[PDB]
Amino acid sequence: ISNKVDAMVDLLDLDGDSYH
Amino acid sequence: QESLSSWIPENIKKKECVYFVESSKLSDAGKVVCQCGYTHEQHLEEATKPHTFQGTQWDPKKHVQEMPTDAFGDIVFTGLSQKVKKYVRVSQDTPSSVIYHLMTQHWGLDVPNLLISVTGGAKNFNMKPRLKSIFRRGLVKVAQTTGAWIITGGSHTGVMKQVGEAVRDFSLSSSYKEGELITIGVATWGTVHRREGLIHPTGSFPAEYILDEDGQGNLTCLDSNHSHFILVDDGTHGQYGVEIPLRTRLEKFISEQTKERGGVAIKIPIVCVVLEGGPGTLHTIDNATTNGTPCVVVEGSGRVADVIAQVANLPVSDITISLIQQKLSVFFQEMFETFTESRIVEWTKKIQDIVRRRQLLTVFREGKDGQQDVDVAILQALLKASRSQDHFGHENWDHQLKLAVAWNRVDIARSEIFMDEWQWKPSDLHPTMTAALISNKPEFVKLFLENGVQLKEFVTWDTLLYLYENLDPSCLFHSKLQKVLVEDPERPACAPAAPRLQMHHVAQVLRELLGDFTQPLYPRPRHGHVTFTMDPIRDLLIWAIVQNRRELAGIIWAQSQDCIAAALACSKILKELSKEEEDTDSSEEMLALAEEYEHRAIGVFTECYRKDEERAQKLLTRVSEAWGKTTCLQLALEAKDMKFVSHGGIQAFLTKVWWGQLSVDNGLWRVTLCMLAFPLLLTGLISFREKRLQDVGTPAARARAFFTAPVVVFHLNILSYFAFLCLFAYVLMVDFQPVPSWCECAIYLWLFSLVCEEMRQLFYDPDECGLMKKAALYFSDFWNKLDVGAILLFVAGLTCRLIPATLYPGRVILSLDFILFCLRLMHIFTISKTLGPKIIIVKRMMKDVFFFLFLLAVWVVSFGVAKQAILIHNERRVDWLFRGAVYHSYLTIFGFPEWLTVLLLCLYLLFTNILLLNLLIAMFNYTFQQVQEHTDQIWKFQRHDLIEEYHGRPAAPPPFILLSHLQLFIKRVVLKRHKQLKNKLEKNEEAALLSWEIYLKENYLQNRQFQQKQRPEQKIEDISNKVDAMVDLLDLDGDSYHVNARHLLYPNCPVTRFPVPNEKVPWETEFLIYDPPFYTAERKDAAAMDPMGDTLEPLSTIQYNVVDGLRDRRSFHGPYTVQAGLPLNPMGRTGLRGRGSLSCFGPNHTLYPMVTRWRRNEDGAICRKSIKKMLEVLVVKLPLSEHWALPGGSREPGEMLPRKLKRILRQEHWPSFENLLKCGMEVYKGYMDDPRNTDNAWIETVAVSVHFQDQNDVELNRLNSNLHACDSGASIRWQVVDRRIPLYANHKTLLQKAAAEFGAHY
Amino acid sequence: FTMDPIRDLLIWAIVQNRRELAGIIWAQSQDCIAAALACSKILKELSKEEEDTDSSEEMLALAEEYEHRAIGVFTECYRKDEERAQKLL
Ligand SMILES: Nc1ncnc2c1ncn2[C@@H]1O[C@H](COP(=O)(O)OP(=O)(O)OC[C@H]2O[C@@H](O)[C@H](O)[C@@H]2O)[C@@H](O)[C@H]1O
Ligand SMILES: Nc1ncnc2c1ncn2[C@@H]1O[C@H](COP(=O)(O)OP(=O)(O)OC[C@H]2O[C@@H](O)[C@H](O)[C@@H]2O)[C@@H](O)[C@H]1O
């Protein structure tokens, strides 16, 4: 269950100039 | 058996190359090979003759011939196994009816229930371990339950070896289980290593084949685990692939043509499955999927599996030939460079034509989080395919669900099979209920119950007999039933040896398990529609409880009749069984289930007692007609239901019946006070309940009821016993005298009356049990055993007193008699509040008091004979030495000689004064502490039987029990328990009582499951389900061508055509590798049809897109282009140059008429679909078409082209009248897709539709009477119209196009 | 190559009290019933002479777990077929 809710909180946290 | 060996050379053929057509490419050491080179310098098993024409490139149709087969028979592998295996060499073309008749009759294989055909890579196959795990459990587990037929290629290499090993070890590990997972292998006869030993011209009923994995060049050898073998021959030698069309053709005929049980047909379901493959695999899948068998592919497996699984959900037009070789060369990275462009276009065409038909395919997806089973995939691959294959099929609805039982998939069967569109009656679930029960599946029987099956209608008599015929043979009850049924002696005459199983047999073992007191449950017949017993549910509960099926019996008890007797009966049966279990795990669960049922009975009883006391009092004494005419309380006493009897209300009932007629509350001393005085009871000094006696004083009846109470009888009996023993002691003491005094005869007759009462205790039982069992039970009584021991000692002492010379011994013998009476006074303090437990304690402690007494005895006699031997000389004094030695030993045991005296006395204080007392300390601390708790319940349990006795005992004292004794003896000479313990109640009263308790049962159950929900593990499970639903919710946040034309396998003409993808179809796109064979039919050079099948000559001069006389060689769509004097398909490329079996080039014009009418109900109104209505068409079925199709003809004649379809079908003269009536409505005209299309000779149609609106008498009457149908055809009939109805798919396009003109359904 | 490598590998794992390792590699044993017995006997003969207040306890408990493993496999194979499993001892 702790792994489930950690995956859940990870998923809810988921929501140049060119010279020489 | 010789019918087979005669039958095979009659029936089956085998191929033979007859002529030497010597191959240009000489084989590897087979340089003498005539393009097959089987067994000669030539390809010949006869004279390689000129045969009047040495035809170069000898045609396999023309060279190779059929011959009768002799190579059949049986086989065994040399030392690798011990069993025998059947095998047949078979022709290339064989009717599958022949092979099915062979495998059924002359091999003895019954019809299956499932056909798994597994295919994979043979010589070059590699697999990860995870893939290996599914073969060991997933394939074997789904094969072994349903009784499948694993059919595969017969080879020792690759995947077929994996199936062969994984089915073998199951048969060894089954431990002599019945049945074997039957396996049939099919391989080509050409590529067999040592087949020259197999050909025996006579019937090779024994044979020996030794496999050798050395000499495998081109060929390969057989596997040794397959149980039947089929060897298709082709006449060729090294070819790979002559087994695929025969296997595919055979699988369909087995699946859908053999089972027709109550109806039209019912198809045995069938699944092809793949693991990893190559060019043999794609041809197998492509040939299979055209025949309607679904195919599941497995992800993460191998080469071909991954490249099919990647292109699963893609649109059909999105396949590029670049993308094919791109995805190909990465997975085929070993042999990626070995690919040519023709192989790429062939594989692109095959993958295209496979992923077109999205119904008939499924991916396993390799979900890999549970990696559940193949079963969850195979079930959905059944269900999607079954709906698409047919919509009117009912076999799948009932045949499929049963299969869904056996793999425990309730979510699937609820969601998919029980959505809608079945219209089942509930009793139709009866057989698929039964197998859900025998296979011990609680979830499906719960779902059938929630769907509406009635148990009370379900359990017939024969159903119950069949239920007991299939017990789990691992259990103890099956072994006991077999030990009875084998020892059943009264079955002399039958066809077999093992006679039958009758219900009185299981009744007989149940009576011996349950106890003697009940009657037999099932009667033996002394010899319809449905034989129904008194109650089905009791016997169902018995069947569930003997096999330790926990959650099942927990379910079905909720529908009981009288649950209180039921849970008692099951707890008693479980306790009587679990002692004899002899297994270290079955006994424990068997005990715990009985304890749970005790709890159930207690919980329902404390409810119904709390509802109403005095009514629930009647419940215990009630005889149950169900359980063999007994009441519950004696059954509970039999079961030692220790927690149950200890309830307060039942003990209050016992106290109420114990205190007799009067009120209960009088204490003990006031009872003795009114016992002492006669006329006090007539006064106002005592209590009475039943206030009619308390108010209205009838002192005769009041004293009668007072003496009727068993407390009074107990007290007068113990008082008479006390006076008897005191007078016996006084007369024994001083009145001993040789002549008989009056007092000795007085105590003798007192004892005589006492033993007549004790004999009456032996001779009462109206429950006609074993009289041997009755005497054993009374002899099992401890106090009765002491009583009869005292009787035997008394009658010994009386005849010793009779001898006048033995007066001193006999008298003191009677002295021991007095001791044997006073121990009976220990019988009192059972009725005490507290002391009875201590009586139980000393009754426990006597058991090791005895075997400690033995060891102390042998120790003290050893010390005594030592003490006798040490301090005396040897003398023969018999009465002088032994008596003084015994006196010295008793003086020891009642608790220069200095060194020896100190040694003797220190040994005496050493071993005697220390050790054995400590042994008793340990032993009696153990036998105390093992029982020092539950004994109060044991006393409460033991309270009953004395009350039982004294209610049974008459009220007279033993000085006056003879008045009752004579009356009872003359009553039983000239000609029954009390009603207060057992009574047949009134039936209507009993029905009210049963309805009352059965109402209270559900009130118990709700709060029971409610509090059972409040255990914390349940809330943990609920929270995990909540968060899994949460993570699921947060995870939630083509080009239309002539595809029936490009399809391979030109009908009725064994040729091929070129692989054409979706890119290179039209004439605009250039296809540089396009080289179709200039293919003509055999009848392409023939009668009135155009002879331009060989139009390379200048004979091709007929009119193009114009009417060349009667041949209207002009398209309805538009002008076709001409190249090299031949027309091209305006639709695109097909892959075959030429005319084919068509009449002429360009379009071949034909008319397809259709008849339509409405489908009426029983009333005559239009039957209704969900929105639209029902339509009927009249279709034909030819005897060698195996298909329904439209009666449409070629438009080579003008108006009789429907008669060219239907001169023989419709009529002769009335046909021209209906042709005059055939002026109807046109739906579609033009080019039609068809498998008989080359690039030159395609099909154009006109489609007319005529209709019947009225379904009475009008135009239809002319269609009825005119009919002259039975000419040269098999069948014609009207038919319902739906999207799943059988037909040619080309004609199904016409119906789906013309159904819009009338608004029918789809 | 010896008669069996896996027995000696199990010996190496079990003398150093490597718990989860030997728990893994026992799954590929040859005849596990003799094996778990041998390891429990070796653990009991070692843990008495351990002279450490923590190594002896875990050394004993692992042997008890291996006793349980041997019991659990034996009660399976006896329940499959009695008289054949009689020959095993
Ligand atoms: N019937 C056969 N038996 C043994 N080996 C074979 C066979 N057919 C082909 N092979 C060898 O297998 C090699 C290629 O094997 P794959 O491509 O992995 O397998 P594939 O050729 O796709 O064969 C599929 C095979 O499954 C069977 O159901 C069917 O008989 C078909 O031959 C080739 O070199 C070929 O010599
Ligand atoms: N559109 C189509 N869809 C499916 N099959 C077709 C189609 N057109 C032709 N066929 C099949 O091609 C085969 C050869 O075509 P014809 O013989 O020209 O068709 P037809 O004359 O309508 O059928 C003659 C019938 O007489 C029997 O001897 C024979 O079994 C065949 O069913 C037939 O078996 C027919 O089933």
Side-chain angles (χ1 to χ4, degrees), chain B residues 1227-1253 1269 1273-1281 1286-1295 1298:
Chain B
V1227 194
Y1228 182 66
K1229 298 178 199 200
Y1231 171 60
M1232 206 179 50
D1233 195 6
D1234 196 278
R1236 281 190 290 173
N1237 296 20
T1238 82
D1239 305 310
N1240 315 327
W1242 58 84
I1243 289 301
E1244 274 206 348
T1245 51
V1246 302
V1248 70
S1249 48
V1250 292
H1251 197 81
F1252 290 161
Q1253 186 43 64
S1275 59
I1276 62 175
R1277 65 184 183 180
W1278 284 98
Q1279 201 50 59
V1280 59
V1281 190
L1287 219 70
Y1288 289 164
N1290 196 354
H1291 296 177
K1292 288 196 58 146
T1293 320
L1294 270 71
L1295 266 298

Side-chain angles (χ1 to χ4, degrees), chain B residues 119-122 124 155 157 160 240 247 277-281 284 303:
Chain B
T119 181
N124 46 186
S155 174
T157 66
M160 298 83 93
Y240 272 154
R247 168 165 54 166
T281 295
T284 284
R303 29 191 206 261

Side-chain angles (χ1 to χ4, degrees), chain B residues 377-385 387-388 393 397 399 401-410 412-414 417-418 422 424-427 429-445:
Chain B
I378 298 167
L379 206 43
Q380 314 184 294
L382 253 305
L383 291 181
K384 304 199 6 242
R387 261 164 344 211
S388 253
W397 284 158
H399 213 97
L401 169 69
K402 161 187 306 175
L403 185 142
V405 162
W407 303 334
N408 201 7
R409 298 300 165 187
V410 289
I412 305 301
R414 175 204 319 278
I417 310 169
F418 278 159
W422 199 13
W424 70 96
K425 61 191 292 186
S427 68
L429 300 187
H430 281 169
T432 179
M433 158 67 79
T434 292
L437 219 52
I438 313 182
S439 175
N440 200 1
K441 312 300 292 312
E443 201 42 67
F444 271 118
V445 68

Side-chain angles (χ1 to χ4, degrees), chain A residues 1 4-5 8 11-12, chain B residues 1020 1024 1028 1030-1031 1034:
Chain A
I1 279 176
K4 280 289 188 176
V5 68
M8 272 300 263
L11 190 48
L12 210 60
Chain B
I1020 286 157
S1024 51
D1028 290 12
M1030 272 300 263
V1031 72
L1034 210 60

